[PDB]
Every structure is written in C-alpha cells, then in structure tokens.
C-alpha cells in the first residue's frame, strides 16, 4: 500500500518533467521553469554567474 | 584583529524546505585532549584561538 498524507506542511518532490525540444530563430510561445512568454529565441554572448 | 575594510557580496549556497521553527542558536568548536589536559569533558580541554 502506497498512501499519501494531507496537512498544512509545504510541498515537496513530485512525479512536471515537461520535456520539449528547443527551436531557435522563430516566433514561438515559450514556458521555461516558471516564466512564460512569446518571442524569438537566439544565442547570446552575455555571461551569467553560475 | 577587527574586520577588514572592504565590500564583498555573498552568493547563495543552499535552500532547504524543512519547514521547522528556529528560535535559538549555538556553535561547535574543537576541544583538544592530550597529555597536557587529561580527563573527561570537565577538566581535560584547551580552547584554541
């Protein structure tokens, strides 16, 4: 038996893992980790911090 | 002695979803035991800077 618990505790691990390939240089409707939008995705020479 | 003169920002290390309540705080150091100070935790211990 695999049973769940329900209370006011915060969330934890789950089962999204929404995987879809990446298309560039086209007007597409994108949805990353938590931020959504529409536009064209290309390559950049800007460097982030890790 | 005394903190240096400068600026330096601090990067994140880890976030934990534990969700317990924290109100107190205490720290852990090294208590040397050797031939100089023998015995239990009550007598045999030097501090260290």
Contacts of B17 in chain A (CB under 8 A): 10-12
What span, in angstroms and rounded, lies between the C-alpha atoms of A32 and A41? 12
Query: How far is the C-alpha of A11 from the C-alpha of B11, rounded, in Å?
Result: 25
Q: Give Cα separations from A39 to A24, A28, A31 (angstroms).
A: 10, 6, 11
Choose among A28, A22, A26, A4: nearest CA to A14: A4
A8: nearest CA in chain B?
B19
Whether residue A16 contacts residue A32, with contact meaning beta carbons closer than 8 Å, is answered with no
Q: Resolution of this PDB entry, in A?
A: 2.8
- In terms of Cβ atoms closer than 10 Å to its own Cβ (0-12, 13-18, 19+), residue A35 is exposed
Is A10–B11 a contact, with Cβ atoms under 8 angstroms apart?
A: no
């Amino acid at each position: 038996v695999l049973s769940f618990e329900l209370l006011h505790a915060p969330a934890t691990v789950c089962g999204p893992k929404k995987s879809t390939n990446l298309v560039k240089n086209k007007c597409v409707n994108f949805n990353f980790n938590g931020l959504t939008g529409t536009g064209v995705l290309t390559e950049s020479n800007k460097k982030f911090l890790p | 002695r005394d903190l240096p003169q400068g600026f330096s920002a601090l990067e994140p290390l880890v976030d934990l979803p534990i969700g317990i309540n924290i109100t107190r705080f205490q720290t852990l150091l090294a208590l040397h035991r050797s031939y100089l100070t023998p015995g239990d935790s009550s007598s045999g211990w030097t501090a260290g800077a």
